[PDB]
């Protein structure tokens, strides 16, 4: 059977906020809405475009399921991705522990169904990020739609 929670996180998301515990060298100019496709076998496929230096990176990432609901793995187990819903509606928080580009990085991402920034959602996102120990800047990102 497929996870009701896994289906609940499927579809179009706007990537809004983005805390960290380390500086991220590459930053996209703007990002395309994120799409989460629930697959048979509990795995989530995830696509986003990052417009950066005036060019479109077309990301595709598969979050492999685990024994713990909420915990997904990617990049051949190199990155963990916890997925939790916000108390604010139409908003989720990703929390990516792991390492990428040969560098250990802890990020948090604020997902929203609607592009309209919610100051209540951002507040809660900060509070959480700080509690987890992500105490850097909070990039609210530019939401473009196409290249």
């Amino acid at each position, epitope marked *: 059977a*497929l996870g009701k929670d896994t*289906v609940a996180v*499927s*579809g*179009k998301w706007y990537l809004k906020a983005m805390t960290a515990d380390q500086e991220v060298p590459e930053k996209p100019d703007s990002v395309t809405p994120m799409i*989460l*496709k*629930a697959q*048979k076998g509990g795995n989530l496929e995830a696509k986003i475009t990052m417009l950066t230096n005036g060019q479109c990176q077309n990301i595709t990432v598969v979050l492999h399921k685990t024994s713990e609901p909420g915990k997904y793995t990617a990049y051949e187990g190199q990155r963990v991705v916890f997925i939790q819903p916000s108390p604010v509606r139409d908003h989720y928080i990703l929390y990516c522990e792991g390492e990428l580009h040969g560098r250990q990085i802890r990020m948090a991402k604020l997902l929203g169904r609607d592009p309209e920034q919610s100051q209540e959602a951002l507040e809660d996102f900060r509070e959480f990020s700080r509690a987890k120990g992500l105490n850097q800047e909070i990039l609210e990102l530019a939401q473009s739609e196409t290249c």
Partner: antibody
Amino acid sequence: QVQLVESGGGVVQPGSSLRLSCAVSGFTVRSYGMHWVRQAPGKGLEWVALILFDGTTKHYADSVKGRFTISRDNSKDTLYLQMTSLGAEDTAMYYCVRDFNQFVKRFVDGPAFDLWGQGTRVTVSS
Amino acid sequence: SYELTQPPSVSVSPGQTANITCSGDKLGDKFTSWYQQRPGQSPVLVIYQDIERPSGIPERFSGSNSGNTATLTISGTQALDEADYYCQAWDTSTVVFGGGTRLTVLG
């Protein structure tokens, strides 16, 4: 208040370019992957094309690929199927359908057509 | 290309359970959907995501997708169920439909 209703149906000649259109109510067409499905008289169902909620993502059957176009006007809340270079094979009852597992708040990799139009018949002959 | 396969025809008596089957490689790794097309009507989704039933559809209908075949099962089969059932699944950036199974409730 029927949710999907097709139009553009009638008669055409091999050298034609009929455009079908599906008028939607109850939901926005920007919100769902929307598919066209033909059924020939006597024959069974045959998927023609889909357009994702992305609106940029469009796939067609190889049978029709190159000849057909799918598109939608979110403002008019209508979905279109531009049939060109019409063959005798194309003659069928054309349905527009909504992939309910291709929604902005539910994308499951398992197409499911909950909403079925009432169709519109197309006959191709010079 | 990828092709689903169903018996052209199935026959059952009133009450007897009916078993329509769908066959293809990588099924059970794929999600299947079932449609009922009653005589002269439009198609109607009866089973989605292999086993999941839409609302309104009676409990008599049930799904299964074990291995390389998928089955639509109709208990308490009665006149109303007489129709052409089609299975469908996604592959190669295409939606594949089966050829359908005319189900006759022998009366």
